[PDB]
């Protein structure tokens, strides 16, 4: 009767917000069972969660802190969890029949690999790791066509908004990433809303001088904060929209909505538009991913629209935010160009973060790596397709660093 | 297969807008069959429509122009329609096995009356007439429980918006006007948007002396224009919301949205808000009523959110717009108080339209009638209940007139 959940990345932002909303929903009735918690290396934080939630499974990716975890957990009386580590631990959790739904709030390799294993085990995947969809969208589509009872349910706020705007009567006849999703759902176009970031109103001359300290002074992780500032975040979310909802790139419109109340909107084929709105918020997207197709009661503050008073919309300047254009171009090229976009941006974002390059150098580097890449035939074998994605991702990061080194 | 529709009141505003969107949609693909057209007395307008749509049935209410109708239709070649008159003709159309959906674009007695026969024949009724729901909501609820396959689908723009925000997998477990509709749809609260009418920036002293000319100089009929100016239209729509969707009065909030892009919003139990938006428009509400639970392609202009640029929201002042408070008071009292509100407002609206009373006298009269009414035992018998509604409607109109004459 309870929804049996695993949280991958349980000490990160998404994971901690998921546990917060689960704790609240479990106050009176047993709505969720927290079956498994996994972290990369935050052993002390994981032990504290284990004390509270007492999951059946605990897993830590970094095997150098496996013994530390086991020793900490011994102190919990009358608790004998299955304590695991590394990729093998992740696969064991994903394979458990006692787990229904998996929240993926880790990035990078562990994120893509856990997503893949969750799908291979026909789970419901509440996916918060947009970079998995960008890097490997065609591969995830292939896997979801094999593993018929698996589903990706979006958690990224804008994509949760789009999903909520749809009619569940139609959504239940398809699933995200499936060919023809937009036709079954009568989707014409998507308005993808953005905060615009901190640099949205600067002149070109001002924008040339910005630094990461300017971008880092709503509070989020450093990487995403930089991607919000360049609007590369939105570019990555355009690609994510294309894959999740089978919407053509020409039918995805970025709109800057600085109040961040409308989270995104869907235009249907009759030209009616449905939007989802709330304060900025991750509890609603996370909870909805775990309750869909139902909703359950929360104690969140109700939206006071009269207090909000004013909502504004404008189109972003592609001269000021060239990362948007690069993402459209990569997405439209398809093949492995999104993989290359993602990987090159990882390097360029970090160089800017660390004060090694200027704002317009971010897009310069990314553009040069995209122009250097040559289309490759897509492997038919799933395990070889994954190998190819990893090869291309590593090549694109090394290529970005080579461009930096040569200019330097 | 095609959507088989009858239009009641086919030369009125709703009826011509219905025929317009049917015509435009049929140019894209032929999906609607107009099976019947019924008009009050525009004998030559009905002829022109029959020429175009060639329905199986034609009906005119006024027997005086009945013969003239038949004369005109002889001139259409290879066209043998069934041509009917009056209430008898309306009942014959509603009983046709050929007709699935009936648009009610008429008012008064004939308005509630045609709605009743459509329900008794288990049809889909696209209902624009809020005064029917306000005045006779109990009779309609009872009828909808006798005739289980009948459904009312709302066309009033705000109520269509609300309905469009829902997941039809949940809607299909219930229907409009059913007890528990909001609980089954997980609805917590409604934002009922309003244009605010012409008087939001007026002071109390300015309102004291406004005239109907000030109200009548978005273009609509006189009665609803005056209701928009006093915000009694919104008050009626609050009661309509309560009946259609079973939302408690303390969970319906009126919000003034002068741009009229967001047409209304639904807050679910998780606090997520979903809204419908488009240009001001009656084509989408009418079309959705006929396509529900599907959507079809239109050639309407797409919403350009960046061009709209700014949306604003504020709370209405109850001191400036006392009709709003009277509507909530009547709705919360329940029983036949809504019937009394509607009927007394019909008289007061017309008194102001004809320069016989001032703006605050409208609410004064309505308030005095409501205070004179005493709750009635609600008949369990459907026929007796309809008689009660008619008796109370008549009483309230006469009481409003009595109050005006005693002061005058
Ligand atoms: O992609 C993102 C971050 C980047 C986007 C953003 C930024 C600020 C607000 C809204 C959107 P962007 O439009 O600038 O690319 N979300 O999905 C953020 C969600 C967090 C919402 C929240 C929770 C707590 C406190 C405050 C904001
Ligand atoms: O109740 C109504 C009329 C009263 C409300 C109103 C008035 C203007 C705009 C929006 C709403 P109110 O909020 O002032 O009470 N609708 O449902 C009107 C729908 C027609 C929309 C449209 C179509 C064509 C041209 C222009 C406006
Ligand atoms: Ca160690
Ligand atoms: Ca929905
Ligand atoms: Ca298209
Ligand atoms: Mn996002
Ligand atoms: Mn209305």
PDB file of N, CA and C in Angstrom, chain B residues 16 26 49 70 80 118 123 125 128 140 148-149 154 163 185 236 252 255 276 278 284 292 328 353 371 403:
ATOM      1  N   UNK B  16     -23.832  31.918 -32.650  1.00  0.00           N
ATOM      2  CA  UNK B  16     -23.080  32.302 -33.835  1.00  0.00           C
ATOM      3  C   UNK B  16     -21.596  32.003 -33.636  1.00  0.00           C
ATOM      4  N   UNK B  26     -14.151  22.703 -39.424  1.00  0.00           N
ATOM      5  CA  UNK B  26     -14.544  21.826 -40.517  1.00  0.00           C
ATOM      6  C   UNK B  26     -13.728  22.100 -41.790  1.00  0.00           C
ATOM      7  N   UNK B  49     -28.758  30.352 -42.147  1.00  0.00           N
ATOM      8  CA  UNK B  49     -27.991  29.290 -41.511  1.00  0.00           C
ATOM      9  C   UNK B  49     -28.322  27.918 -42.097  1.00  0.00           C
ATOM     10  N   UNK B  70     -41.170  28.018 -43.286  1.00  0.00           N
ATOM     11  CA  UNK B  70     -41.323  26.894 -44.195  1.00  0.00           C
ATOM     12  C   UNK B  70     -41.263  27.394 -45.638  1.00  0.00           C
ATOM     13  N   UNK B  80     -34.809  18.549 -47.617  1.00  0.00           N
ATOM     14  CA  UNK B  80     -36.077  18.260 -46.961  1.00  0.00           C
ATOM     15  C   UNK B  80     -35.859  18.159 -45.451  1.00  0.00           C
ATOM     16  N   UNK B 118     -32.811  18.373 -22.492  1.00  0.00           N
ATOM     17  CA  UNK B 118     -31.570  17.774 -22.989  1.00  0.00           C
ATOM     18  C   UNK B 118     -31.042  16.745 -21.989  1.00  0.00           C
ATOM     19  N   UNK B 123     -28.209  13.665 -22.918  1.00  0.00           N
ATOM     20  CA  UNK B 123     -27.276  14.283 -23.842  1.00  0.00           C
ATOM     21  C   UNK B 123     -26.103  14.946 -23.097  1.00  0.00           C
ATOM     22  N   UNK B 125     -24.641  18.475 -22.609  1.00  0.00           N
ATOM     23  CA  UNK B 125     -25.225  19.801 -22.681  1.00  0.00           C
ATOM     24  C   UNK B 125     -24.112  20.815 -22.450  1.00  0.00           C
ATOM     25  N   UNK B 128     -23.983  27.606 -21.369  1.00  0.00           N
ATOM     26  CA  UNK B 128     -23.403  28.935 -21.266  1.00  0.00           C
ATOM     27  C   UNK B 128     -24.130  29.760 -20.180  1.00  0.00           C
ATOM     28  N   UNK B 140     -31.034  20.897 -11.191  1.00  0.00           N
ATOM     29  CA  UNK B 140     -30.134  20.303 -12.163  1.00  0.00           C
ATOM     30  C   UNK B 140     -29.354  19.167 -11.550  1.00  0.00           C
ATOM     31  N   UNK B 148     -28.340   9.411 -15.724  1.00  0.00           N
ATOM     32  CA  UNK B 148     -26.959   9.204 -15.346  1.00  0.00           C
ATOM     33  C   UNK B 148     -25.985   9.444 -16.496  1.00  0.00           C
ATOM     34  N   UNK B 149     -26.462   9.309 -17.747  1.00  0.00           N
ATOM     35  CA  UNK B 149     -25.609   9.483 -18.902  1.00  0.00           C
ATOM     36  C   UNK B 149     -25.583  10.935 -19.390  1.00  0.00           C
ATOM     37  N   UNK B 154     -19.218  23.015 -18.917  1.00  0.00           N
ATOM     38  CA  UNK B 154     -19.338  24.472 -18.830  1.00  0.00           C
ATOM     39  C   UNK B 154     -18.718  25.222 -20.009  1.00  0.00           C
ATOM     40  N   UNK B 163     -12.251  23.851 -15.924  1.00  0.00           N
ATOM     41  CA  UNK B 163     -12.471  22.500 -16.413  1.00  0.00           C
ATOM     42  C   UNK B 163     -11.298  22.000 -17.258  1.00  0.00           C
ATOM     43  N   UNK B 185     -11.306  15.183  -7.875  1.00  0.00           N
ATOM     44  CA  UNK B 185     -10.301  15.883  -8.661  1.00  0.00           C
ATOM     45  C   UNK B 185      -9.190  16.503  -7.818  1.00  0.00           C
ATOM     46  N   UNK B 236     -22.328  35.935  -9.374  1.00  0.00           N
ATOM     47  CA  UNK B 236     -23.055  34.815  -9.947  1.00  0.00           C
ATOM     48  C   UNK B 236     -22.089  33.690 -10.321  1.00  0.00           C
ATOM     49  N   UNK B 252     -13.145  29.844  -2.829  1.00  0.00           N
ATOM     50  CA  UNK B 252     -13.244  30.514  -4.123  1.00  0.00           C
ATOM     51  C   UNK B 252     -12.797  31.947  -3.917  1.00  0.00           C
ATOM     52  N   UNK B 255     -10.288  37.399  -8.226  1.00  0.00           N
ATOM     53  CA  UNK B 255      -9.075  38.184  -8.427  1.00  0.00           C
ATOM     54  C   UNK B 255      -9.296  39.010  -9.690  1.00  0.00           C
ATOM     55  N   UNK B 276      -5.493  28.224 -17.150  1.00  0.00           N
ATOM     56  CA  UNK B 276      -5.701  28.248 -18.601  1.00  0.00           C
ATOM     57  C   UNK B 276      -5.573  29.675 -19.072  1.00  0.00           C
ATOM     58  N   UNK B 278      -5.310  32.390 -22.720  1.00  0.00           N
ATOM     59  CA  UNK B 278      -5.450  32.654 -24.138  1.00  0.00           C
ATOM     60  C   UNK B 278      -5.904  34.105 -24.272  1.00  0.00           C
ATOM     61  N   UNK B 284     -12.636  29.174 -27.914  1.00  0.00           N
ATOM     62  CA  UNK B 284     -12.021  28.041 -27.264  1.00  0.00           C
ATOM     63  C   UNK B 284     -12.976  27.394 -26.258  1.00  0.00           C
ATOM     64  N   UNK B 292     -14.418  17.889 -25.771  1.00  0.00           N
ATOM     65  CA  UNK B 292     -14.097  17.207 -24.531  1.00  0.00           C
ATOM     66  C   UNK B 292     -14.514  15.754 -24.627  1.00  0.00           C
ATOM     67  N   UNK B 328     -21.671  35.970  -2.132  1.00  0.00           N
ATOM     68  CA  UNK B 328     -21.103  35.022  -1.195  1.00  0.00           C
ATOM     69  C   UNK B 328     -22.083  34.753  -0.057  1.00  0.00           C
ATOM     70  N   UNK B 353     -30.115  50.114 -15.538  1.00  0.00           N
ATOM     71  CA  UNK B 353     -29.970  50.243 -16.980  1.00  0.00           C
ATOM     72  C   UNK B 353     -30.914  51.343 -17.486  1.00  0.00           C
ATOM     73  N   UNK B 371     -32.971  39.623   2.756  1.00  0.00           N
ATOM     74  CA  UNK B 371     -33.329  39.637   4.171  1.00  0.00           C
ATOM     75  C   UNK B 371     -34.799  39.269   4.376  1.00  0.00           C
ATOM     76  N   UNK B 403     -39.885  47.005  -3.367  1.00  0.00           N
ATOM     77  CA  UNK B 403     -38.927  47.831  -2.636  1.00  0.00           C
ATOM     78  C   UNK B 403     -38.605  49.101  -3.412  1.00  0.00           C
TER      79      UNK B 403
END
